[PDB]
Design a protein around this ligand. Sequence first.
Ligand SMILES: COc1ccc(CCN(C)CCC[C@](C#N)(c2ccccc2Br)C(C)C)cc1OC
Ligand SMILES: [Ca+2]
Ligand SMILES: [Ca+2]
Ligand SMILES: [Ca+2]
Lengths: 219, 219, 219, 219
Amino acid sequence: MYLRITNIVESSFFTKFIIYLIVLNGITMGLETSKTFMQSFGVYTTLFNQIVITIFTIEIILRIYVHRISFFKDPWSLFDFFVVAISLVPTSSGFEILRVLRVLRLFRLVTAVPQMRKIVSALISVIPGMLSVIALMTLFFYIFAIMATQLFGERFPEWFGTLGESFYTLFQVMTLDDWSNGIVRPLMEVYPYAWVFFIPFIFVVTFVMINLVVAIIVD
Amino acid sequence: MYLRITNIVESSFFTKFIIYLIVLNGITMGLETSKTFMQSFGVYTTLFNQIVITIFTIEIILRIYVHRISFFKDPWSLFDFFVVAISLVPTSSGFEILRVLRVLRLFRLVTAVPQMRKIVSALISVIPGMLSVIALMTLFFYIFAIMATQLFGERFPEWFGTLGESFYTLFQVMTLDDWSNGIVRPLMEVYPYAWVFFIPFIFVVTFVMINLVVAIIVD
Amino acid sequence: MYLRITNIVESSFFTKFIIYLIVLNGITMGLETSKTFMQSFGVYTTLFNQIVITIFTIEIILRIYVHRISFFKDPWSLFDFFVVAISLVPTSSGFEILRVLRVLRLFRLVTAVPQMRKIVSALISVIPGMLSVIALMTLFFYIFAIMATQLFGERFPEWFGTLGESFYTLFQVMTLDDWSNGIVRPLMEVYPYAWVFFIPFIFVVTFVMINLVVAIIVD
Amino acid sequence: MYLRITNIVESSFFTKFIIYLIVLNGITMGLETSKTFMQSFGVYTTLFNQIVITIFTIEIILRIYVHRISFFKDPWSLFDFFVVAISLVPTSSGFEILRVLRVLRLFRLVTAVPQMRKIVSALISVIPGMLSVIALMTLFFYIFAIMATQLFGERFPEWFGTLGESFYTLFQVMTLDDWSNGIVRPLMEVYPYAWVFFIPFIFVVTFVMINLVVAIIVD
Ligand SMILES: COc1ccc(CCN(C)CCC[C@](C#N)(c2ccccc2Br)C(C)C)cc1OC
Ligand SMILES: [Ca+2]
Ligand SMILES: [Ca+2]
Ligand SMILES: [Ca+2]
């Protein structure tokens, strides 16, 4: 009974059938943001959403039947599973973010449509080499998050009152977002010398990113 | 009678002549932005323009006999066509904006100088390779924009009330422009976990971008 | 019994563990950020803090007896030395800014983990190459800061009132932080030609940067 | 006479002495930043200045004899000539800006130090191969600056009343500086489609720039 379906899955028609559905649901999903649309035609779309979700679930099972254990070591396939499984919990008691997460299902376009997968693959592939600098930056940020909560969090709770807040604010400055008129000049009206931790924090932070990118190019 | 024209149109005087006209027009088009200039010299310029549009109009018709079906298979020539074209379409009819669109005709200086066109060509030529990254990034933006409108549009209709607006703000965060104190910090005052939405978004979008340059460089 | 003591601190059991105390101190220090936590658990960590500082002190002393003159020509241990020493400076010198500098010893995880060291050292190696770039820039900065102070200082004391202040604003404009709406537009209301100063400045600082990166790549 | 004068100017003593003098006049002008310093030592620094311009006028004179007409074919010296010459034009009456342009003489540290000469010349060296893109981009800016003024200049004069104003504003958007909340969102409150102008625009300027940098790198 294996042989019957295995021929169905590998067909030009199975894949193209799934892909045409995704691009369709993605067009559907666009229209789902207009509440006005959701009046005049709202009923069609909860249905369409239930149908596609059913089809995909069936479709994942056959592929596991066909691929067995070789399915759960293909990351692209694992993602489609995790992206499909996610899309199935009822949106009531569970966080209502999952009603919003189900648009991730459009990322199935990447997994099933070639060219798209490689680019993601090329990109993911620079990540393991970098994990160390990522560990560095995170330890670095953390040492500085601690310093900032203690140095400025008393008088400036919105920016530095909590360790998590300190991370964020600190993150903004690295992204160079309104950082001087916005955060430190305020800081200097009380702390004339905050530039001693924000001007160098900025140098380091800039220095590493630039050197990281450079290190990508050489490699 | 068909045989006579080709030797005129192809001459190095022809090409030298048209480029001169573009530069004079471009000087005059600068002048048209000045009000003072207009009372004082308005009427010379409004008429100079239609003489130039005809001369260009004459050149294109002529160029089509010599180059035949292959005229319209030339991308450089097609631009030439539509740009003088748009300067021919009447004012009240269609839009009113295209009257002002006319300034685009200074871009003929690019079409007609071999040195400019090759840079442009070289520039255009990285793109067929980018069409994967454009496609990929457009798909990614689309997906987060849908999530953002539904997450954030009822309480912030100005910013996310709508898909377009959702796109717009997301392009903006991507350019890192006042992204935090100006969009996300406010957001965070009603929706605290918005940093989970935008800080990841920021990483992804700036990462994809950086790596795009490396493969441009290497290739 | 020399080599026996030497046997001890060079062991893999000792270091990973004291690395683990770093990881441990790193955790409690995050915890010290909470006023809630500090209230009902303050003595656990006021306690946890004293043991660790002591342990680190014996290690530094010991590693010296093992290495002697060699200890003090190792850049990573001098760092190690100085950041424990700082913690051996008491609570107050009026400047209780030092009690905050204590959390600097968490950079010891960098000194203590060879894979960390590899990354930092790679990063440093970039710098000497740029010492030439650094002097030219600091000079241009020095002069223009002077022109700025004299030019804008009387009417705009916050921004340019002072050599140091013009330095800060100039650094800000160089990071391209709200440079237009935030500084130059206001200035031109009093001094309409200020664009003749700052756009050239921007031009140079952007330019040199770009060029800075290119040098890094080749090096 | 000729050879006797010619042999002191070319010496390691002459130029070291001038460099030594330049560093003081640079240190001296920073002190002139402090009106505090000026009411307490201003008489010391007002003539230290005065004899330095004397010495430099003389130094310049000697160097002219040694190199004759070939002096005015040297970029660094012609620079030295005018940059000192400027400080000799009388402050009073005709114009008072000329007093501040006098500070440019501190740029001679570059002129007189060969490492500095090496750096600058290297920098200038990348410019000739960039000019063509300067031409295209400047031509693009010139086209859109015309457009922004006719399109947005009526209702928004501060930003677009004048070409220079559209240039400056486009340059800002180019510098990507507070462009959405600061510029285009307001435009959009009257002209909802203003983004069809500005969003493509940002794509272009960012694209050309990267590829400009990239073109630099590979060679
Ligand atoms: C995420 O961390 C970052 C932290 C910091 C920066 C530098 C940001 N930059 C100052 C903003 C625009 C500046 C730029 C130049 N200058 C530019 C970009 C696009 C168009 C024109 C220009 Br003039 C360019 C080199 C990124 C980038 C980061 O990611 C890319
Ligand atoms: Ca920025
Ligand atoms: Ca900014
Ligand atoms: Ca800003």
